Design a protein around this nucleic acid. Sequence first.
RNA 1: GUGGGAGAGGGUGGUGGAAUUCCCGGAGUAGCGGUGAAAUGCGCAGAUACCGGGAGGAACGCCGAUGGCGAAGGCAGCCACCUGGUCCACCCGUGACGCUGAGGCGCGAAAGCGUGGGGAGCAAACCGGAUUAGAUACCCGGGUAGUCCACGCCCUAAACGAUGCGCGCUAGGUCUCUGGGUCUCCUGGGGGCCGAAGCUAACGCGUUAAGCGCGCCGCCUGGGGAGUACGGCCGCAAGGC
Lengths: 116, 70, 101, 87
Amino acid sequence: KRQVASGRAYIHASYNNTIVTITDPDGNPITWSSGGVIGYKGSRKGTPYAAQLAALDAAKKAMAYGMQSVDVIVRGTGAGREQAIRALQASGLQVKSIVDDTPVPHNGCRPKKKFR
Amino acid sequence: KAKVKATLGEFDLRDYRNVEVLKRFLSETGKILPRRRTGLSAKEQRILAKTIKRARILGLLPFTEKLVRK
Amino acid sequence: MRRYEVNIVLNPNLDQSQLALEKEIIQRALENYGARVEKVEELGLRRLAYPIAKDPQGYFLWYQVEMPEDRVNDLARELRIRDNVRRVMVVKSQEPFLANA
Amino acid sequence: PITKEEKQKVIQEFARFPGDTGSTEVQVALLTLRINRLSEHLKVHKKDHHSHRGLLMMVGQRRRLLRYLQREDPERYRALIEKLGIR
RNA sequence: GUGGGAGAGGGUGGUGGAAUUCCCGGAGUAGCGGUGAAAUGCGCAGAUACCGGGAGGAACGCCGAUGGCGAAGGCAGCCACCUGGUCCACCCGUGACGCUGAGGCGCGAAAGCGUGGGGAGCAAACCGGAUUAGAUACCCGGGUAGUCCACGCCCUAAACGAUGCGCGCUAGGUCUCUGGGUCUCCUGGGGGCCGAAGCUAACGCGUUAAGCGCGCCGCCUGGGGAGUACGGCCGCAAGGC
Ligand SMILES: [Mg+2]
Ligand SMILES: [Mg+2]
Ligand SMILES: [Mg+2]
Ligand SMILES: [Mg+2]
Ligand SMILES: [Mg+2]
Ligand SMILES: [Mg+2]
Ligand SMILES: [Mg+2]
Ligand SMILES: [Mg+2]
Ligand SMILES: [Mg+2]
Ligand SMILES: [Mg+2]
Ligand SMILES: [Mg+2]
Ligand SMILES: [Mg+2]
Ligand SMILES: [Mg+2]
Ligand SMILES: [Mg+2]
Ligand SMILES: [Mg+2]
Ligand SMILES: [Mg+2]
Ligand SMILES: [Mg+2]
Ligand SMILES: [Mg+2]
Ligand SMILES: [Mg+2]
Ligand SMILES: [Mg+2]
Ligand SMILES: [Mg+2]
Ligand SMILES: [Mg+2]
Ligand SMILES: [Mg+2]
Ligand SMILES: [Mg+2]
Ligand SMILES: [Mg+2]
Ligand SMILES: [Mg+2]
Ligand SMILES: [Mg+2]
Ligand SMILES: [Mg+2]
Ligand SMILES: [Mg+2]
Ligand SMILES: [Mg+2]
Ligand SMILES: [Mg+2]
Ligand SMILES: [Mg+2]
Ligand SMILES: [Mg+2]
Ligand SMILES: [Mg+2]
C-alpha cells in the first residue's frame, strides 16, 4: 500500500533452494518469494525453474506494490542463481545494476565436516 | 593487459599513507593483486603486502569491496 | 631512543575548541612520555574506504618523532584512551625502499 | 639489545692491547655479556624456549674458550674469571 | 671485529576487518532447512531472506608460491617491545681454541590428565531421523568432554627425506629464494627438477649423494608369538621407556 517506486532486489541462492526478497532503498523488505513459496517442496526447490518462478512471483508482488526501478544483490552459489536474474530481466522491471555480495569469511570459523 | 608497475611512476613501496598509487595494486574487489598482474618481484610484492595491510588498518584502503555486473 | 611515526585518526566533526583540545592532549602525552617531534604532517579530513565508528570520514594526523623505546606501547595505550580518538597506529621509521626507479 | 657503545666499551675494556678485537679474553667477555643479557630475559618469559637453546649454545662456547685459556696460560684464566666473576 | 641483509624463528602486550552464533529494533509472510529422495528439526510466541545496533569466542581471506624460518615438534592479519639462529662483504683480531657424543639435562604435533577460567563454530560419547536383510556405520538434525587461555603433567607418531652429525673430494644444465659484484653474466648461501662419472637387487640416488673417503654416535641379525610376559624405572591416571 506504500507505492514504493524504486527498490532493492536480493537473491539468496543455495543448492537446496533459491529465494528472493524485494525491499525499499533503505533496505526494508517489501515482498518476497522462494521455491517453497510456489508449489515445489523437496529438492525440486533448488532447481532453476523454481528460481524463475520465484523471481517472477516476487516481481509481480512488487508490481502490485508499485515497483519499477530495481537494483539487484546476489548472494551465494546455487543452481538457477543465474536463472533468477534472467527472470528479473524479463520481469518487466528495469534492472539498474547487478552486484555479487556473497559473504565469504577471512576464515574465522571451523566449517562443518561436509565443508572440508 | 600490461601489469601494474609497467604503467606507473617511481614510487615508494613502504609508504602506507599514499593511497593514489596503492589503490592501483588492488583489484576490482579489495583483493591484493597477484604477482602475475602486479609485475613486481618477490621482495617487492612482499613489502607491498605489509604496506597495503598497514593502510587498510588506517581505513585508507578497502579490506574488501563488492563485485559488479555478473 | 628511536625514530617512530605516530598515526592518529580522530572524529571528523570536532569544533575548533574540541580539536585544539584533543591536539593539546596529544602534545601533552608526547611531552610526558619523552618524545621529541622531528616533524608533523596534518592531512585532516579524508574519506575512509570503510566506515570507522559509524562514520564515512576521518581526521588525520601524522607525527615523525624520536623517543625511548620502552615507553612506546604505553604511549599508544594512553593515546587511545580519548573517546574522540578512533585510530592510533605507531610505526618504526624506515628508509624509503623504491621501485620502477 | 646490545648497542655499539656498550660493545666497544666492553671490548676496549678487555683488550690485550690496542686494536685487539679477537682475543680469547675479549671473546669470553662479549659472550658473558650476551649471556647475562639473555638470562635476565629468561627470568621473565620463562616460556621462550628457542632463545633458551641459544643460551645453551652461548654457554657451551664460553666454557669451551675458557677451557682453552686455562689450558694454555692458567694465570690469564684466573685473571679473567675473577674479573668477570664466573665458573 | 666492523659493516650490511632476508625471514609465518620464539616470548609478551596491544589491536583491525570479514564471517558464524546469540540478543535488541525496523520492515516483512509461509515456510525455512536438508538429501539420491526423504524424515527428525525449526516456524503464527512471526522463523527463513533484508536493513540498522549490540555481545562474545575462535581463526586470520587476497597477498601465497612448486616461497620463507627453525635443531625438531612446528611457525601466517597488523603494531610495538624483549630475544634466538643465520647469510654476505672487508682480510682487521685470537692462534687448532677442532669433530662426534654412551650417560645426564632441556625441547617435544595431536589426543589425554589435574586445578581454575573461557565456550562462538566444530564436534568422541550420546539423543534422534533416515538407509538397509540388519545400520551399532557411512548421509541428515541436535549435542557433552574437548578444541581456546593460565599454571603443572603426560614424552608418544607414517615425530618421514621412512635417508644420524661434521669435513674433504668427483661434469654440467635448468627454475628459484637471498646477499655481494667491474650486473648478457660472475660469485657465495638456501629451495627444486633433469642428468657425467660412480652407486644400487631394482625403483632410483647423482656438489641438497643413496658416489669416492675419514672420524664419532644410534641401530639390525628369519616370520608369528610380541612391543605381549616377568623384573625395573618413570607416571595422578591413561600409559610410557
Ligand atoms: Mg530441498
Ligand atoms: Mg578511543
Ligand atoms: Mg614472527
Ligand atoms: Mg610471535
Ligand atoms: Mg527479529
Ligand atoms: Mg509452530
Ligand atoms: Mg511444529
Ligand atoms: Mg511450538
Ligand atoms: Mg555468550
Ligand atoms: Mg594458499
Ligand atoms: Mg611436517
Ligand atoms: Mg634478529
Ligand atoms: Mg689476517
Ligand atoms: Mg701472530
Ligand atoms: Mg654437537
Ligand atoms: Mg608433548
Ligand atoms: Mg594438546
Ligand atoms: Mg584440561
Ligand atoms: Mg553442528
Ligand atoms: Mg553429527
Ligand atoms: Mg653411515
Ligand atoms: Mg645482485
Ligand atoms: Mg633450512
Ligand atoms: Mg645453490
Ligand atoms: Mg650412468
Ligand atoms: Mg636426479
Ligand atoms: Mg657429504
Ligand atoms: Mg643404499
Ligand atoms: Mg623367532
Ligand atoms: Mg606401544
Ligand atoms: Mg625376567
Ligand atoms: Mg610394569
Ligand atoms: Mg606408582
Ligand atoms: Mg597404547
